[PDB]
Amino acid sequence: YKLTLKLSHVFSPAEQLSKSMDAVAESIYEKTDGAINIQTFPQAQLPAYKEGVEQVVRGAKFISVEDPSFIGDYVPDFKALYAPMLYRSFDEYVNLTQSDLVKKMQAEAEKQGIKILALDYIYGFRNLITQKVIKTPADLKGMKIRTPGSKSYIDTLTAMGAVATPLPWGETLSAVQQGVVDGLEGSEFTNIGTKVYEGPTKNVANTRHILGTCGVYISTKVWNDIPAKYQKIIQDEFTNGANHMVNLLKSQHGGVVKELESYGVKFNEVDGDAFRAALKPLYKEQKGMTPGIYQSIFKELDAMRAENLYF
Numbered sequence: 408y409k410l411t412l413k414l415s416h417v418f419s420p421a422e423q424l425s426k427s428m429d430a431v432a433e434s435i436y437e438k439t440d441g442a443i444n445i446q447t448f449p450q451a452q453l454p455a456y457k458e459g460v461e462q463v464v465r466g467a468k469f470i471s472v473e474d475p476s477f478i479g480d481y482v483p484d485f486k487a488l489y490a491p492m493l494y495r496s497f498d499e500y501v502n503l504t505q506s507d508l509v510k511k512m513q514a515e516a517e518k519q520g521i522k523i524l525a526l527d528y529i530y531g532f533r534n535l536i537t538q539k540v541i542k543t544p545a546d547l548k549g550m551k552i553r554t555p556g557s558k559s560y561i562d563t564l565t566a567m568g569a570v571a572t573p574l575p576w577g578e579t580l581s582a583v584q585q586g587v588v589d590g591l592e593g594s595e596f597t598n599i600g601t602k603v604y605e606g607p608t609k610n611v612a613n614t615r616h617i618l619g620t621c622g623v624y625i626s627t628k629v630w631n632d633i634p635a636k637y638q639k640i641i642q643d644e645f646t647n648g649a650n651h652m653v654n655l656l657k658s659q660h661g662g663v664v665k666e667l668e669s670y671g672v673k674f675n676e677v678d679g680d681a682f683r684a685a686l687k688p689l690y691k692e693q694k695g696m697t698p699g700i701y702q703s704i705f706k707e708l709d710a711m712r713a714e715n716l717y718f
Protein backbone atom coordinates (compact mmCIF):
# COMPACT_ATOMS: atom_id res chain seq x y z
CA TYR A 408 0.00 0.00 0.00
CA LYS A 409 1.19 3.50 -0.92
CA LEU A 410 -0.43 6.90 -0.45
CA THR A 411 1.06 10.32 -1.04
CA LEU A 412 -0.68 13.36 0.51
CA LYS A 413 -0.04 17.09 0.06
CA LEU A 414 -0.27 19.02 3.33
CA SER A 415 -0.90 22.75 3.02
CA HIS A 416 -0.82 25.57 5.56
CA VAL A 417 -0.04 29.29 5.57
CA PHE A 418 2.77 29.41 8.15
CA SER A 419 6.45 30.22 7.68
CA PRO A 420 9.36 27.80 8.15
CA ALA A 421 10.51 29.52 11.38
CA GLU A 422 7.14 28.96 13.03
CA GLN A 423 6.56 25.91 15.20
CA LEU A 424 3.33 25.05 13.34
CA SER A 425 5.46 24.41 10.25
CA LYS A 426 8.13 22.52 12.18
CA SER A 427 5.48 20.36 13.86
CA MET A 428 3.85 19.46 10.57
CA ASP A 429 7.26 18.44 9.18
CA ALA A 430 8.00 16.35 12.28
CA VAL A 431 4.65 14.58 12.23
CA ALA A 432 4.87 13.91 8.49
CA GLU A 433 8.37 12.47 8.91
CA SER A 434 7.30 10.37 11.91
CA ILE A 435 4.34 8.94 10.01
CA TYR A 436 6.52 8.14 6.99
CA GLU A 437 9.02 6.32 9.17
CA LYS A 438 6.48 4.49 11.31
CA THR A 439 4.52 3.31 8.26
CA ASP A 440 7.69 2.09 6.56
CA GLY A 441 7.11 4.62 3.76
CA ALA A 442 3.50 3.61 3.06
CA ILE A 443 2.03 7.00 4.05
CA ASN A 444 3.97 9.89 2.55
CA ILE A 445 2.76 13.29 3.69
CA GLN A 446 4.66 16.07 1.94
CA THR A 447 4.44 19.54 3.49
CA PHE A 448 3.96 22.87 1.73
CA PRO A 449 4.27 25.97 3.90
CA GLN A 450 3.45 29.62 3.18
CA ALA A 451 0.28 29.08 1.17
CA GLN A 452 2.10 27.90 -1.93
CA LEU A 453 -0.74 25.37 -2.31
CA PRO A 454 -4.47 26.02 -1.80
CA ALA A 455 -4.87 27.29 1.75
CA TYR A 456 -7.40 28.95 4.03
CA LYS A 457 -10.86 28.03 2.66
CA GLU A 458 -9.33 26.93 -0.63
CA GLY A 459 -7.37 24.26 1.25
CA VAL A 460 -10.46 23.04 3.08
CA GLU A 461 -12.23 22.92 -0.28
CA GLN A 462 -9.66 20.42 -1.58
CA VAL A 463 -10.44 18.25 1.46
CA VAL A 464 -14.18 18.43 0.87
CA ARG A 465 -13.59 17.55 -2.82
CA GLY A 466 -11.70 14.39 -1.91
CA ALA A 467 -8.19 15.37 -2.97
CA LYS A 468 -5.10 13.58 -1.66
CA PHE A 469 -4.63 16.55 0.57
CA ILE A 470 -4.40 17.56 4.22
CA SER A 471 -5.50 21.07 5.13
CA VAL A 472 -4.17 22.60 8.34
CA GLU A 473 -6.19 25.70 9.23
CA ASP A 474 -8.04 27.08 12.21
CA PRO A 475 -11.55 25.71 12.80
CA SER A 476 -13.22 28.85 11.51
CA PHE A 477 -12.20 27.62 8.04
CA ILE A 478 -14.43 24.58 8.36
CA GLY A 479 -17.31 26.55 9.86
CA ASP A 480 -19.09 27.17 6.55
CA TYR A 481 -19.33 23.39 6.15
CA VAL A 482 -19.92 22.55 9.83
CA PRO A 483 -21.38 25.57 11.66
CA ASP A 484 -20.84 24.29 15.22
CA PHE A 485 -17.12 24.94 14.64
CA LYS A 486 -17.91 28.65 14.54
CA ALA A 487 -19.00 28.26 18.18
CA LEU A 488 -15.87 26.32 19.08
CA TYR A 489 -13.80 29.21 17.64
CA ALA A 490 -15.79 31.95 19.34
CA PRO A 491 -13.89 34.82 20.95
CA MET A 492 -12.86 35.07 24.61
CA LEU A 493 -13.95 31.51 25.43
CA TYR A 494 -10.68 29.98 26.63
CA ARG A 495 -8.52 31.09 29.53
CA SER A 496 -5.63 28.70 28.91
CA PHE A 497 -4.29 26.27 26.33
CA ASP A 498 -5.24 23.42 28.69
CA GLU A 499 -8.92 24.43 28.87
CA TYR A 500 -9.19 24.22 25.12
CA VAL A 501 -7.32 20.90 24.91
CA ASN A 502 -9.67 19.53 27.55
CA LEU A 503 -12.72 20.71 25.64
CA THR A 504 -11.43 19.10 22.44
CA GLN A 505 -11.39 15.75 24.31
CA SER A 506 -15.04 16.08 25.43
CA ASP A 507 -17.98 14.07 24.11
CA LEU A 508 -19.36 17.40 22.91
CA VAL A 509 -16.45 17.92 20.53
CA LYS A 510 -16.51 14.27 19.48
CA LYS A 511 -20.10 14.87 18.38
CA MET A 512 -18.92 17.90 16.40
CA GLN A 513 -16.25 15.75 14.74
CA ALA A 514 -18.98 13.29 13.73
CA GLU A 515 -20.88 16.20 12.14
CA ALA A 516 -17.74 17.07 10.18
CA GLU A 517 -17.42 13.47 8.96
CA LYS A 518 -20.98 13.64 7.60
CA GLN A 519 -19.85 16.65 5.56
CA GLY A 520 -16.85 14.73 4.23
CA ILE A 521 -14.23 16.16 6.60
CA LYS A 522 -12.23 13.83 8.83
CA ILE A 523 -10.71 15.84 11.67
CA LEU A 524 -7.41 14.41 12.95
CA ALA A 525 -6.75 17.17 15.51
CA LEU A 526 -8.14 20.53 16.62
CA ASP A 527 -5.39 21.63 19.02
CA TYR A 528 -2.24 22.58 17.13
CA ILE A 529 -2.30 25.69 19.31
CA TYR A 530 -0.14 28.55 18.01
CA GLY A 531 -1.17 30.96 20.76
CA PHE A 532 -3.59 33.56 22.05
CA ARG A 533 -4.10 36.20 19.37
CA ASN A 534 -3.44 39.77 20.57
CA LEU A 535 -3.74 43.17 18.92
CA ILE A 536 -0.55 44.37 17.22
CA THR A 537 -0.52 48.09 16.43
CA GLN A 538 1.39 51.32 16.99
CA LYS A 539 -0.90 52.36 19.85
CA VAL A 540 -1.67 51.55 23.46
CA ILE A 541 -5.07 49.90 23.19
CA LYS A 542 -6.99 49.23 26.42
CA THR A 543 -10.68 49.44 25.50
CA PRO A 544 -12.92 49.02 22.44
CA ALA A 545 -13.17 52.80 22.12
CA ASP A 546 -9.40 52.92 21.47
CA LEU A 547 -9.86 50.92 18.24
CA LYS A 548 -12.13 53.51 16.62
CA GLY A 549 -11.28 53.91 12.93
CA MET A 550 -8.36 51.51 13.13
CA LYS A 551 -8.10 49.14 10.21
CA ILE A 552 -6.99 45.81 11.62
CA ARG A 553 -6.11 42.96 9.30
CA THR A 554 -7.70 39.62 10.08
CA PRO A 555 -7.83 36.31 8.23
CA GLY A 556 -10.71 35.92 5.79
CA SER A 557 -13.42 34.17 7.79
CA LYS A 558 -16.61 35.44 9.42
CA SER A 559 -15.33 34.47 12.90
CA TYR A 560 -12.47 36.94 12.66
CA ILE A 561 -14.36 39.67 10.84
CA ASP A 562 -17.17 39.59 13.41
CA THR A 563 -14.76 39.48 16.36
CA LEU A 564 -12.65 42.50 15.34
CA THR A 565 -15.78 44.43 14.30
CA ALA A 566 -17.39 43.84 17.71
CA MET A 567 -14.11 44.81 19.40
CA GLY A 568 -14.44 48.24 17.77
CA ALA A 569 -12.06 48.02 14.79
CA VAL A 570 -12.46 48.19 11.04
CA ALA A 571 -11.87 44.53 10.22
CA THR A 572 -9.89 44.08 6.98
CA PRO A 573 -9.90 40.41 5.96
CA LEU A 574 -6.74 39.53 4.02
CA PRO A 575 -4.62 36.43 3.49
CA TRP A 576 -1.28 36.53 5.28
CA GLY A 577 0.55 37.13 2.01
CA GLU A 578 -1.27 40.47 1.55
CA THR A 579 -0.67 41.56 5.16
CA LEU A 580 2.82 42.69 6.23
CA SER A 581 3.48 45.11 3.39
CA ALA A 582 -0.06 46.44 3.91
CA VAL A 583 0.83 47.14 7.56
CA GLN A 584 4.14 48.77 6.54
CA GLN A 585 2.32 51.06 4.09
CA GLY A 586 -0.58 51.99 6.36
CA VAL A 587 -3.18 50.27 4.18
CA VAL A 588 -4.09 48.76 7.53
CA ASP A 589 -3.15 50.26 10.89
CA GLY A 590 -2.34 46.93 12.49
CA LEU A 591 -3.13 43.25 12.75
CA GLU A 592 -3.66 40.61 15.39
CA GLY A 593 -1.87 37.42 16.25
CA SER A 594 0.03 35.45 18.81
CA GLU A 595 3.50 36.21 20.08
CA PHE A 596 4.69 33.14 18.16
CA THR A 597 3.36 34.61 14.91
CA ASN A 598 4.85 38.00 15.89
CA ILE A 599 8.37 36.66 16.41
CA GLY A 600 8.23 33.93 13.76
CA THR A 601 7.28 36.21 10.87
CA LYS A 602 9.19 39.22 12.28
CA VAL A 603 6.09 41.43 12.56
CA TYR A 604 8.17 43.39 15.11
CA GLU A 605 10.63 44.53 12.39
CA GLY A 606 7.78 46.60 10.99
CA PRO A 607 6.17 49.67 12.56
CA THR A 608 3.70 47.83 14.82
CA LYS A 609 5.54 47.17 18.09
CA ASN A 610 2.68 47.58 20.58
CA VAL A 611 0.89 44.43 21.66
CA ALA A 612 -2.37 44.65 23.60
CA ASN A 613 -3.06 41.44 25.51
CA THR A 614 -6.69 41.08 24.41
CA ARG A 615 -6.33 37.30 23.94
CA HIS A 616 -9.48 37.66 21.88
CA ILE A 617 -9.18 34.32 20.07
CA LEU A 618 -7.13 31.27 20.95
CA GLY A 619 -5.24 30.61 17.73
CA THR A 620 -5.21 26.90 16.91
CA CYS A 621 -5.04 24.77 13.78
CA GLY A 622 -7.04 21.70 13.06
CA VAL A 623 -5.92 18.98 10.67
CA TYR A 624 -8.41 17.93 8.01
CA ILE A 625 -8.48 15.12 5.46
CA SER A 626 -11.26 13.88 3.19
CA THR A 627 -13.34 11.06 4.66
CA LYS A 628 -13.25 9.42 1.22
CA VAL A 629 -9.45 9.33 1.27
CA TRP A 630 -9.30 8.41 4.96
CA ASN A 631 -11.68 5.48 4.60
CA ASP A 632 -9.45 3.89 1.95
CA ILE A 633 -6.42 3.84 4.25
CA PRO A 634 -5.80 0.47 5.92
CA ALA A 635 -6.68 0.52 9.64
CA LYS A 636 -3.10 -0.13 10.76
CA TYR A 637 -1.97 3.07 8.99
CA GLN A 638 -5.01 5.07 10.14
CA LYS A 639 -3.99 4.33 13.71
CA ILE A 640 -0.41 5.49 13.15
CA ILE A 641 -1.53 8.65 11.34
CA GLN A 642 -4.00 9.47 14.11
CA ASP A 643 -1.60 8.70 16.95
CA GLU A 644 1.17 10.77 15.43
CA PHE A 645 -1.08 13.80 14.82
CA THR A 646 -2.35 13.58 18.41
CA ASN A 647 1.18 13.26 19.78
CA GLY A 648 2.39 16.17 17.63
CA ALA A 649 -0.36 18.44 18.97
CA ASN A 650 0.48 17.56 22.55
CA HIS A 651 4.14 18.35 21.90
CA MET A 652 3.36 21.70 20.21
CA VAL A 653 1.01 22.76 23.01
CA ASN A 654 3.51 21.86 25.73
CA LEU A 655 6.39 23.47 23.87
CA LEU A 656 4.68 26.81 23.27
CA LYS A 657 3.39 26.89 26.85
CA SER A 658 7.03 26.55 27.91
CA GLN A 659 8.41 29.10 25.46
CA HIS A 660 5.93 31.90 25.89
CA GLY A 661 7.74 33.77 28.67
CA GLY A 662 11.00 33.68 26.77
CA VAL A 663 9.36 34.79 23.53
CA VAL A 664 7.83 37.78 25.30
CA LYS A 665 11.24 38.73 26.71
CA GLU A 666 12.89 38.37 23.33
CA LEU A 667 10.20 40.52 21.67
CA GLU A 668 10.66 43.09 24.43
CA SER A 669 14.40 43.15 23.63
CA TYR A 670 13.47 44.15 20.07
CA GLY A 671 11.40 47.06 21.33
CA VAL A 672 7.97 45.45 21.55
CA LYS A 673 5.83 46.83 24.35
CA PHE A 674 3.06 44.76 25.89
CA ASN A 675 0.04 46.16 27.72
CA GLU A 676 -2.95 44.71 29.49
CA VAL A 677 -6.49 45.65 28.54
CA ASP A 678 -9.86 46.12 30.17
CA GLY A 679 -10.89 42.50 29.77
CA ASP A 680 -14.47 43.00 30.95
CA ALA A 681 -14.98 45.82 28.47
CA PHE A 682 -13.87 43.60 25.58
CA ARG A 683 -15.94 40.69 26.92
CA ALA A 684 -19.05 42.89 26.99
CA ALA A 685 -18.44 44.06 23.41
CA LEU A 686 -18.10 40.44 22.23
CA LYS A 687 -20.94 38.77 24.15
CA PRO A 688 -23.50 39.45 21.39
CA LEU A 689 -21.51 37.10 19.12
CA TYR A 690 -22.54 34.04 21.16
CA LYS A 691 -25.70 33.63 19.10
CA GLU A 692 -26.76 30.53 17.19
CA GLN A 693 -26.38 30.61 13.43
CA LYS A 694 -28.21 28.49 10.90
CA GLY A 695 -27.02 24.89 10.88
CA MET A 696 -25.72 24.97 14.45
CA THR A 697 -26.85 22.43 17.01
CA PRO A 698 -29.49 23.97 19.27
CA GLY A 699 -27.90 25.01 22.55
CA ILE A 700 -24.32 24.60 21.33
CA TYR A 701 -23.00 27.73 23.09
CA GLN A 702 -24.71 26.76 26.32
CA SER A 703 -23.18 23.28 26.01
CA ILE A 704 -19.70 24.77 25.54
CA PHE A 705 -20.17 27.15 28.49
CA LYS A 706 -21.35 24.27 30.69
CA GLU A 707 -18.17 22.29 29.96
CA LEU A 708 -15.87 25.26 30.58
CA ASP A 709 -17.69 26.23 33.78
CA ALA A 710 -17.39 22.66 35.08
CA MET A 711 -13.67 22.33 34.35
CA ARG A 712 -13.02 25.71 36.02
CA ALA A 713 -15.11 24.74 39.04
CA GLU A 714 -13.23 21.46 39.46
CA ASN A 715 -9.84 23.15 39.06
CA LEU A 716 -10.78 25.73 41.70
CA TYR A 717 -11.95 22.99 44.07
CA PHE A 718 -8.75 20.92 43.83
Ligand SMILES: O=P(O)(OC[C@@H](O)CO)OC[C@@H](O)CO
Nearest residue numbers: 417418419473474555576597601
Ligand atom coordinates in the same frame (compact mmCIF):
# COMPACT_ATOMS: atom_id res chain seq x y z
O1 LIG B 1 -3.17 35.13 10.88
P1 LIG B 1 -3.10 33.96 10.03
O2 LIG B 1 -3.65 34.09 8.65
O3 LIG B 1 -3.88 32.82 10.85
C1 LIG B 1 -4.39 31.69 10.07
C2 LIG B 1 -4.39 30.44 10.90
O4 LIG B 1 -5.37 30.52 11.89
C3 LIG B 1 -4.59 29.22 9.98
O5 LIG B 1 -5.93 29.05 9.51
O6 LIG B 1 -1.66 33.45 9.89
C4 LIG B 1 -0.88 33.21 11.09
C5 LIG B 1 0.60 33.37 10.83
O7 LIG B 1 1.31 32.84 11.96
C6 LIG B 1 1.10 32.81 9.49
O8 LIG B 1 2.52 32.91 9.26
